[PDB]
Design a protein around this ligand. Structure first.
Ligand SMILES: Nc1ncnc2c1ncn2[C@@H]1O[C@H](CSCC[C@H](N)C(=O)O)[C@@H](O)[C@H]1O
Lengths: 6, 227
């Protein structure tokens, strides 16, 4: 899924 | 060093898969659940996917056919609905989360009558029928497989392509290395790692493209077309 860069 | 394989970051493979299954089981069967709160990007995504695919559909010796596609980690069928069903006579779906496939039947509406098989299986356990698909679409799921399972899955996919068929991977890519997300139990790999895996599966790159117009804060996303 698309997601914020950790 | 950065990490270059999943065996550097996955403590326990059974737990890596079990945790992912548990995570998806408690996500709502909606586009926003599929896209992790970024449901609003769907149209940008589908528009770019469509343009990318249409490169392979022009008339000529190598024209990709339009009889059957396979949507891998399809979820509720966001991609099946807006990209694939309009272009392919039939579409098969595979996903690990039974609730998503059940919701698909509602989400897809009347056009969903052209979904042939709904396979409820992990990719790591799925062997697509030989010589069956013109396009195998794998979006936002490869991070859920180990390197060995991904390489193997891409080999089985290769064996299920029709003449002139292609495999498309579209996913998040890390700036460098292999990065574990321990909440959804997935990894994000850099472009060199992903290309290494594609090559180990006996596949070659036809095209690679960065997804534009995404929010600044999320992982970069790339599409690869393979055969
Ligand atoms: N090991 C695995 N095998 C198959 N599907 C998996 C899986 N691990 C996670 N999934 C599925 O992968 C999907 C990630 S969300 C992306 C959904 C779809 N590709 C889209 O872009 O709209 C979920 O539907 C989840 O159930």
């Amino acid at each position: 899924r698309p997601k914020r860069i950790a | 060093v950065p990490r270059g394989s999943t065996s550097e970051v996955i403590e326990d493979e059974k737990q890596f898969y079990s945790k992912a299954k548990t995570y998806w089981k408690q996500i709502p069967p909606t586009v926003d659940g599929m896209l992790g709160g970024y449901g609003h990007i769907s149209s940008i995504d589908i528009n770019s996917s469509r343009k990318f695919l249409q490169r392979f559909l022009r008339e000529g010796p190598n024209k990709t056919g339009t009889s059957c596609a396979l949507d891998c980690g399809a979820g509720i069928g966001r991609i099946t609905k807006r990209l694939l069903l309009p272009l392919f006579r039939e579409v098969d779906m595979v996903d690990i989360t039974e609730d998503f496939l059940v919701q698909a039947k509602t989400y897809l509406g009347e056009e969903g009558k052209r979904v042939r098989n709904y396979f409820c299986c992990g990719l790591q356990d799925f062997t697509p029928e030989p010589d069956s698909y013109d396009v195998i679409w794998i979006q936002w799921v490869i991070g859920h497989l180990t390197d060995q399972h991904l390489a193997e899955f891409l080999r089985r996919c290769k064996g299920s392509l029709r003449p002139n068929g292609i495999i498309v991977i579209k996913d998040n890519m890390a700036q460098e290395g292999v990065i574990l997300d321990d909440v959804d139990s997935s990894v994000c790999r850099d472009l060199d790692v992903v290309r290494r895996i594609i090559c180990s599966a006996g596949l070659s790159l036809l095209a690679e493209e960065r997804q534009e117009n995404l929010p600044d804060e999320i992982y970069h996303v790339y599409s690869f077309a393979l055969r």
